[PDB]
């Protein structure tokens, strides 16, 4: 049966879970993304109960890989209507400054005698063409757009089994298979779907918007993606609507337009709350893929872990990693309000490296924990906790080994920890 | 009546660099009053007076034929064009190195350009100076014709870049990467006349003809360059600079939009005009043949009406009210370069 864990710290009393390996140790759980998992147990051999091996399962945050197509820059524009009545002849093309606009559509009207709209400022009787046009001026880039081709979700699995340590990236199709441990990411539920268009108003780490309907074959002024700036050039929409030849002051011919005059970007801004937004952390983009970490628990993973029953206890307990803890400094204050920081010199021996967790206990309960990869020699670890009462000298505890010295505090995350300690 | 010209200053003045620039559109004045226009200062800075001297312009106008029979239908010959030399004073005609060294010389440039139709001219007043004048001057009152201009210096955010989702992004200072955060900034360029003895290095019109891939033109003898200012505050930019990515992009925007932005009064928002037709003229008027062409129009003042012929290195200044002078770089003959140029430039950006 699966167990849907959630991020947050829970006050636990002293203790460290010990599991006698009579059967395969099986873990079935689902955790949210942006939530690191820390599962720590001592695996004990049923025969010779003094053979206990450390097991530390560290599951890093979920990174999401998306095969993407670079669609270019979305562009805002200004709807400008212009009417040019030629006093004679046809309407010239690309002969005036307004026809340098990024994109435009013009309609050529014949001169109809008897209409009555004859301007008095032509050198005589004007009989030429009336060139009515819509001109999109002052085109500005408002952000980049990317189309999702495919999606893949991986989580970094790090394991400390006895004196051995390994880290491997796991995804749905590439389970971690070792001789003793198997980590399988069986499924991933997502807010992102293939063919979605990701729009970034600013930098990548500033967030994005999801568009289910992004203009492709038929592009109209006002649609999401109407004006696009591509490497090949400017891709422009149809200016949906029609022209109407009117007469102003019974003298000058003027044209009017029936249709949308608001750009797609401005119509998106007016309805921004209707678009799925998403936050982004540690983004990495190439010419073919986008990689980031969702920090809003929008993603959820399902992980299965199997530890084989027949561990090589003799080879895994040769020179056990020995750490020594000394409490040195403490910042912040106590209580359930302000929280505190605990500095501790941790000295491991025998082993070259060691993945474990140091905890912040008092006399009765632990209020915080920090997991780190200890490098041979001296290590300085910082622990953040919350709680304590008069005389609760805060100390650093490795499972159950706490430092001899204890430090008291002063007057007034999204991680999962599971070391089997009693609640 | 008075009009407030706002000088949008950076917040860092003591640690600031470059210049501060502003511009304002003035009400239209009739054509007769143009030659007697004088820009009066009364400010508390060091005004550069070179632009306040007289310069000969070939005033080039069109008008309907006086002897036009009743109900005569408009044609290419129902109207005439004429040209004559006239002394104009106060226009934006900055000598070289003046704007570039304004930060060191601590001088302030104030001038105006003209955007005209057949009967009136609308002046666009430009004012640029050192960053420190945002403190030493603060408030002033300029004067032009029957108009006064209240000059205010106010500290403003993102004077040199663009606001993206509330965060200021300035153009990249150099271009190692490829394509990333793009900002769109306004540039105001000013034509500079600078001749050299031998080379073709100052024939800027040959650079435009290269950008539009037009071969075989020989009427590009003009010698000069442009000095641009980005936003309301930046260091002066030399156009063209062969290793500056900003220079190549500003030059490219000029090649495909030679007349730049308009100085329209978007009130009423009824953009209707009458195209009188293609016209040619004599610049200077003592010439024996036509040297400049354009499009004669009738309507409200829209684009700049001043420029120089690209053919002569001795600058032939043309003031053509009611005529949009030929600026398309793809032609070879009778083309002009504008005195001032306003555009919007897409540039790679980075956070302040």
């Amino acid at each position: 049966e699966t167990q849907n864990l959630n991020s947050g710290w829970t006050d636990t009393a002293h203790g460290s879970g010990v599991i006698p390996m009579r059967t395969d140790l099986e873990l079935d759980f689902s955790l949210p993304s942006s939530a690191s998992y820390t599962y720590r147990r001592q695996l004990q051999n049923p025969a010779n109960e003094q053979e206990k091996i450390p097991f530390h399962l560290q599951i890093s945050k979920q990174v999401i890989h998306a095969e993407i197509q670079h669609l270019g820059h979305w562009m805002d524009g200004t709807f400008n209507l212009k009417t040019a009545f030629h006093c004679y002849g046809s309407c010239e093309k690309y002969a005036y400054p307004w026809q340098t606009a990024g994109c435009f559509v013009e309609k050529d009207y014949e001169y109809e005698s008897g209409w009555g709209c004859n301007p008095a400022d032509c050198p005589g009787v004007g009989t030429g063409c009336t060139a009515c046009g819509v001109y999109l001026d002052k085109l500005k880039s408002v952000g980049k757009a990317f189309k999702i081709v495919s999606l893949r979700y991986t989580r970094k699995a790090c394991i400390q089994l006895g004196t051995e340590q390994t880290c491997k990236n796991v995804d749905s199709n590439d389970c971690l298979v070792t001789t003793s441990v198997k980590v399988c990411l069986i499924g991933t539920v997502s807010k992102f779907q293939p063919s979605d268009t990701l729009l970034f108003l600013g930098p990548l780490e500033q967030g994005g918007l999801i568009f289910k309907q992004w203009c492709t074959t038929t592009c109209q002024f006002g649609d999401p993606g109407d004006i696009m700036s591509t490497p090949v050039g400017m891709k422009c929409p149809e200016l949906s609507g029609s022209f109407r030849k009117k007469c102003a002051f019974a003298t000058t011919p003027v044209c009017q337009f029936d249709g949308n005059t608001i750009s797609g970007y401005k119509r998106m801004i007016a309805t921004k709350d209707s678009f799925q937004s998403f936050n982004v952390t540690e983004p990495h983009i190439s010419a073919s893929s986008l990689e980031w970490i969702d920090p809003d628990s929008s993603l959820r993973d399902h992980i299965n872990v199997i530890v084989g029953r027949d561990l090589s206890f003799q080879d895994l307990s040769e020179t056990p990693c020995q750490v020594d803890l000394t409490t040195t400094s403490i910042d912040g204050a106590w209580g359930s309000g302000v929280g505190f920081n605990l500095i501790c010199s941790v000295s491991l021996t025998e082993c070259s490296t060691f993945l474990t967790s140091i905890k912040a206990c008092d006399s009765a309960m632990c209020y915080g924990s920090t997991t780190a990869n200890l490098v041979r020699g001296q290590n300085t670890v910082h622990i953040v906790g919350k709680g304590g009462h008069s005389g609760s000298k805060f100390m650093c505890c490795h499972d159950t080994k706490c430092s001899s010295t204890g430090l008291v505090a002063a007057a007034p995350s999204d991680k999962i920890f599971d070391d089997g300690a009693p609640e | 009546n008075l009009n407030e010209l706002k000088m949008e200053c950076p917040h860092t003045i003591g640690l600031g660099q470059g210049l501060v620039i502003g511009s304002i559109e003035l009400p239209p004045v009739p054509l007769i009053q143009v030659e007697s226009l004088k820009l009066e200062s009364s400010c508390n800075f060091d005004l550069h007076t070179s632009t306040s001297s007289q310069q000969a312009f070939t005033k080039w106008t069109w008008e309907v034929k006086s002897d036009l029979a009743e109900n005569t239908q408009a044609s290419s010959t129902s109207f005439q064009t004429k040209s004559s030399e006239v002394n104009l004073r106060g226009l934006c005609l900055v000598p070289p190195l003046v704007i570039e060294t304004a930060a060191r010389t601590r001088k302030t440039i104030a001038c105006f350009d003209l955007s005209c139709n057949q009967t009136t001219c609308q002046p666009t007043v430009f004012l640029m100076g050192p960053i420190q004048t945002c403190i030493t001057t603060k408030s002033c009152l300029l004067g032009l014709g029957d108009q006064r201009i209240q000059v205010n210096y106010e500290k403003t955010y993102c004077v040199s870049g663009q606001l993206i989702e509330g965060i200021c992004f300035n153009p990249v200072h150099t271009q190692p990467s490829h394509t990333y955060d793009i900002v769109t900034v306004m540039v105001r360029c000013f034509l500079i006349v600078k001749k050299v003895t031998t080379g073709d290095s100052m024939k800027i019109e040959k650079s435009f003809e290269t950008l539009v891939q037009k071969t075989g033109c020989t009427d590009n003898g003009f010698q000069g360059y442009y000095v641009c200012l980005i936003g309301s505050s930046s260091e002066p930019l030399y156009i063209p600079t062969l290793d500056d990515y900003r220079s190549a992009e500003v030059l490219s925007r000029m090649a495909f939009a030679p007349h730049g932005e308009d100085h329209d009064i978007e009130k009423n928002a009824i953009s209707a005009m009458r195209i009188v037709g293609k016209v040619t003229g004599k610049a200077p008027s003592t010439e024996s043949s036509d040297t400049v062409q354009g499009i004669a129009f009738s309507g409200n003042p829209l684009y700049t009406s001043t420029g120089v012929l690209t053919a002569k290195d001795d600058p032939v200044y043309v003031w053509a009210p009611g005529i949009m002078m030929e600026g398309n770089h793809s032609v070879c003959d009778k083309k002009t370069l504008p005195l001032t140029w306003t555009g919007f430039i897409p540039l790679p950006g980075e956070i302040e």
Partner: antibody
Amino acid sequence: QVQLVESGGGVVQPGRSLRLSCAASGFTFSSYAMHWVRQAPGKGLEWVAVTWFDVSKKDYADSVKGRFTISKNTLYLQMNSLRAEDTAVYYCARNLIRYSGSYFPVHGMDVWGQGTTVTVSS
Amino acid sequence: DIVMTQSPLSLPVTPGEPASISCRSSQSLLHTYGYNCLDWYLQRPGQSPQLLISLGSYRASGVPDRFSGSGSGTDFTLKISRVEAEDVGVYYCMQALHPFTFGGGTKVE
């Protein structure tokens, strides 16, 4: 400048074929109508055909209707089944018209071609 | 049908006097727009025809003031004051609409 140059003129027998051409330059071909006017030896002037409003509308004279078809910025005139009474010097002319499908001039034929000669008699 | 009739087939005169040419139509040339659809052309001995008057009375550009057009309906007239040496040639009135019928020629010398 603006000018019209004709070509393709010659001399053949009745019943054969001939095609004239008129190369225009200096003016927009969609703003002016283009006429063909011939002049028999020692005789007056005779209008032949015309095209206007770009090249979408065409008209011909009764004496030639159905036999000629008025088609680089050049104008063509295909003379098919040219009977022996079309002997003339054929001119190419332009004129300004109101911008509409309905032909109505603003002024007459101002600039003409130098003319081309075609005689058919056997 | 419709045909144009020109008066004197030949108009010989000295240099420096008035001259008159008439052109009469079978039907009215006054269009609903208010213009007389008639032009006046001149053909010098070795030259192509040239434009003198368009739409009855509108003197063409580049044509000196001595030429003048007048008339309405069916009776039109071309006046030329102080005939010069350059005026030699044949004069043709032409209908400005489709049936573009010519007058037939009037010789001056």
